[PDB]
């Protein structure tokens, strides 16, 4: 029966107004809104004849109880209509307008303010003061000649002469540049404190230009002014006018919908082309600073919520970025030679550097364009209801193309280069470009593609489109884009924010050093949870001490453990021991809740039947969150697990080649199903036979298990489950408690991230290797030693870094470490083995690989040193759909 307009309560029913279309409003608006139409439609009632009776005066029940502002709103200005009267006259207005000349510092202008705010309460005065404003603003500040002029129009008018005289001249320090200072300090903090001059500015006025019936393009011409475009702090304030302005002005529109009268009665404001292009003008400016910047974005987004807008606003952009995009071809070009030709000692010519250095380049016009593209396409959109399909059309439309691969080029030359310059992050705001153009894109299962090797070095990105150029451009610069994170690491939680989606890219040492500061670093103030072991009754010892505790305040609380088996709790390996040796309890074949892997005994694996130990449950739970607490405190607990548990710890589908490792006759027969020997001359049912103490009962793995039968058909999908259930459903539930454990330590969001042998690399302390125990603790069959391919290999192998060796160790060697004594103890799965390094011809130009149940390997014979390098990495680093899967 009634609505709320502020907080008070009227009838509706006995009304005029509709609040479907006021209650969309945050009733604030409201308050005022519904004031005007109070007063307008009660002056209606006054003069017009035949008036209706929901009005009926909006009741004395509504003017003596409606808030006092209301009623003085309606019953003060109506006894003023024709007691708290204007204070002074017009030409006091004018005498206390001339202020603005008297430039003075800030303090003594408060005065001016206050009294200003409380000259208003009077539509004489507010009319008045807006006026003269605008007047200011618009025809005197241009010249100095023509301040003047509207100086003696102002206090000619003061005097009541209007009639002009006396040649008043200006205090002679008086600049446009001050009146125009003063002016829009005194307009915005009018604008913010008091409303009603938002409606004023707006509202049309009736005294085709547009600026006599409207106010607000009296500002919209302070915008192609070079005077105030040149100033970053009048810039500031004309948009935080124009961020509340235009803020109701969307406001009003969207809330209206149906019944429109405010669009139908103030005549809200239509923008044409060029009004929107000033506008956008504002990111183009040397002056637009961050601040400047956020407002006008605030702006853009208002103006879109218009009709009409939008598009408008789009093809504006779109046409900058395309007259951009011209000079940054050929800014880039120039510089891509440069750097080519800087020998030693020399730099860049300092006019070159001074395009890509200054805050009013076009690389920073570029980001600002683009960035913009992406408000307004993402600015309250829900993550779905965005057209990104769309998006990129617009990115498609700027031709990029050729910046891009200018980019890539010009990127190339500083990571092959020796220049004191070379500072890639000169092109920072240029690089940060490109991960805008991509960080709506969708970006998922082109990463998944793999088995491509060194076919970088001449990649064009003139028509790559947007949903391929992410990856292509950031695998081709990964050295670089990694040495540029090394320095400033903050890159990462900002411009390169969305490297987290090509964490493929992301070298080791960064992908540590971002993983503990977000993550381990946010923890401190750690109170004390000691627990006191014995030194061989240790895992139960700590475990049972506290074996149902907090798993929250265990981890954010420092273990000051006094354990008994010796002295000491801390400082001096008390402690690091104790984190040291802990896991190796964990294993202890006793408990039966791990495996000396079948293939290695100084690997260690959950255990088929891992449940089998009698305490399980909280015996692998323990080994979660034990390693979650040494890899956020520190430390190492040396493992092997298995690689298929590095994936489920990081929950990915796991791959074939694990059963290699795993169960070797297994995998000859597996892979003897997929492959090799399968003509259905495999047959047997299909599912996996389920041991139970030796009672095989073959579950049927998917619902029809034993239903379906291992045929050649059906081959594949017969392994895939098997090798599944035998790495994963082998062990099924039971790691479930190992991933809370971890899990609850260390978040999974966190751990993503990384993948397999980083993973391991972390856990484990990363190891180092010995070229030449890789050269007598070693096999070369069908290759000599210094062949041709074997010999640059060995390059290859030099050239690689620590963490690129672990791997290459660890592509041989299955899940890391050295054997110790030099390699001479290559622990095959039989125990004894050594490094194999098949030819196994087999397309001599694809993709390696190996097989660490004999401590394999496979070289492909390439020809060349470069892709073989490549693909040598590729392989190393691959884990998923090359060495991983099949």
């Not at 029940?61 to 003023?80: M, N, Q, S, Y």
């Not at 829009?184 to 004023?200: G, N, P, T, V, W």
């Not at 298929?644 to 995998?667: A, C, H, T």
């Not at 054997?819 to 390094?837: A, M, Q, R, W």
Request: proline residues 3%; charged residues 25%; aromatic residues 10%.
């Amino acid at each position: 029966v009634y609505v709320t307009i502020q907080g008070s309560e009227v009838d509706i029913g006995g009304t005029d107004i509709d609040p479907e279309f006021m209650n969309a409003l945050p009733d604030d608006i409201r308050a005022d809104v519904f004031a005007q139409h109070v007063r307008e439609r009660r002056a209606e009632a006054r003069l017009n004849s035949d008036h209706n009776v929901h009005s009926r005066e909006i009741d004395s029940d509504f003017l003596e109880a409606i808030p006092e502002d209301i009623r003085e709103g309606i019953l003060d200005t109506e006894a003023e209509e024709q007691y708290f009267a204007p204070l002074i006259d017009r030409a006091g207005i004018a005498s206390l307008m001339k202020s603005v000349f008297i430039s003075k510092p800030y303090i003594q202008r408060e005065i001016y303010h206050e009294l200003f705010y409380r000259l208003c309460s009077s539509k004489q005065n507010r009319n008045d003061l807006m006026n003269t404003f605008l007047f200011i603003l618009s025809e005197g500040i241009i010249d100095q000649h023509s301040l003047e002029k509207v100086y003696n129009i102002i206090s000619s008018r003061a005097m009541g002469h209007a009639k002009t005289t006396t040649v008043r001249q200006l205090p002679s320090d008086c600049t446009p540049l001050t009146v125009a200072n003063q002016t829009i300090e005194i307009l915005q903090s009018l604008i913010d404190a008091d409303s009603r001059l938002k409606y004023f500015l707006i509202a049309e006025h009736d005294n085709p230009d547009k600026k006599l019936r409207w106010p607000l393009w009296h500002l919209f011409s302070l915008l192609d002014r070079k005077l105030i475009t040149d100033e970053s702090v009048l810039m500031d304030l004309l948009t935080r006018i124009l961020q509340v302005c235009t803020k109701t002005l969307a406001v009003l529109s969207t809330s209206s919908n149906g019944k429109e009268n405010l669009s139908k009665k103030f005549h809200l404001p239509s923008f044409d082309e060029d009004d929107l292009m000033k506008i956008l003008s504002i990111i183009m400016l040397d002056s637009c600073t961050t601040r400047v910047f956020q407002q006008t974005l605030n702006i853009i987004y208002n103006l879109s919520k218009l009709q009409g807008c939008m598009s408008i606003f789009t093809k504006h952009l779109v046409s900058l970025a395309i007259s951009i995009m011209s000079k940054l071809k050929s800014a880039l070009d120039g510089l891509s030679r440069e750097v080519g030709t800087i020998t030693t000692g020399m730099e860049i010519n300092s006019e070159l550097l001074q395009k890509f250095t200054l805050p009013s380049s076009d690389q920073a016009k570029l980001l600002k364009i683009l960035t913009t593209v992406d408000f307004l396409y993402t600015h309250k959109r829900k993550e779905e209801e965005r057209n990104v399909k769309d998006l990129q059309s617009l990115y498609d439309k700027m031709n990029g193309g050729p910046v891009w691969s200018s980019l890539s080029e010009c990127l190339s030359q500083f990571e092959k280069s020796q220049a004191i310059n070379t500072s890639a992050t000169i092109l920072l705001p240029l690089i940060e470009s490109l991960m805008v153009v991509c960080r709506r894109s969708d970006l998922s299962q082109n990463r998944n593609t793999a088995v491509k090797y060194e076919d970088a070095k001449l990649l064009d990105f003139s028509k790559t489109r947007v949903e391929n150029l992410f990856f292509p451009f950031t695998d081709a610069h990964k050295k670089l884009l990694n040495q540029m994170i090394r320095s400033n690491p903050k890159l990462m939680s900002g411009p390169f924010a969305l490297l987290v989606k090509n964490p493929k890219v992301l070298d080791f040492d960064n992908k540590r050093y971002f993983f503990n500061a977000k993550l381990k670093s946010d923890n401190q103030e750690r109170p004390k949870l000691p627990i006191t072991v014995r030194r061989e009754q240790v895992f139960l010892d700590s475990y049972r001490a506290l074996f149902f505790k907090t798993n929250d305040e265990i981890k954010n609380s420092k273990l000051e453990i006094t354990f008994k088996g010796e002295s000491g709790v801390d400082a001096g390996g008390v402690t690091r021991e104790w984190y040291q040796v802990l896991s190796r309890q964990m294993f202890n074949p006793d408990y039966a809740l791990f495996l000396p892997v079948p293939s290695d005994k100084t690997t260690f694996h959950p255990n088929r039947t891992s449940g089998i130990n009698p305490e399980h449950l909280s015996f692998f739970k323990f080994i979660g969150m034990i390693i979650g607490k040494a890899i956020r405190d520190q430390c190492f607990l040396d493992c092997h697990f298995s690689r298929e548990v590095y994936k489920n710890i990081l929950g990915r589908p796991v791959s074939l080649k694990d059963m290699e490792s795993l169960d070797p006759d297994y995998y000859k027969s597996l892979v003897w199903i997929l492959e090799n020997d399968i003509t259905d001359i495999i047959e047997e049912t299909f599912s996996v036979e389920t041991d139970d103490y030796g009672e095989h009962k073959v579950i049927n793995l998917i619902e029809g298990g034993k239903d379906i039968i291992v045929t050649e058909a059906n081959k594949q999908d017969y392994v895939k489950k098997v090798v599944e259930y035998k790495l994963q459903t082998s062990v099924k539930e039971q790691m479930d408690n190992f991933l809370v454990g971890f899990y609850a330590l260390i978040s999974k969001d966190l751990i993503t991230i990384f993948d397999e042998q980083e993973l391991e690399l972390l856990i484990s302390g990363l190891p180092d290797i010995d070229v030449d125990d890789w050269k007598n603790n070693t096999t070369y069959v069908n290759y000599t030693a210094t062949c041709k391919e074997v010999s640059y290999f060995w390059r290859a192998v030099r050239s690689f870094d620590a963490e690129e060796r672990a791997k290459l160790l660890q592509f041989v060697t299955g899940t890391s470490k050295v054997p110790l004594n030099g390699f001479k103890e290559l622990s095959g799965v039989n125990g004894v083995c050594k490094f194999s390094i098949h030819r196994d011809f087999g397309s001599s130009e694809r993709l390696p690989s190996s097989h660490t149940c004999f401590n394999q390997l496979n070289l492909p014979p390439y020809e060349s040193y470069e892709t073989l390098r490549g693909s040598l990495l590729l392989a190393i680093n691959e884990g998923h759909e090359g060495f991983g899967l099949a």
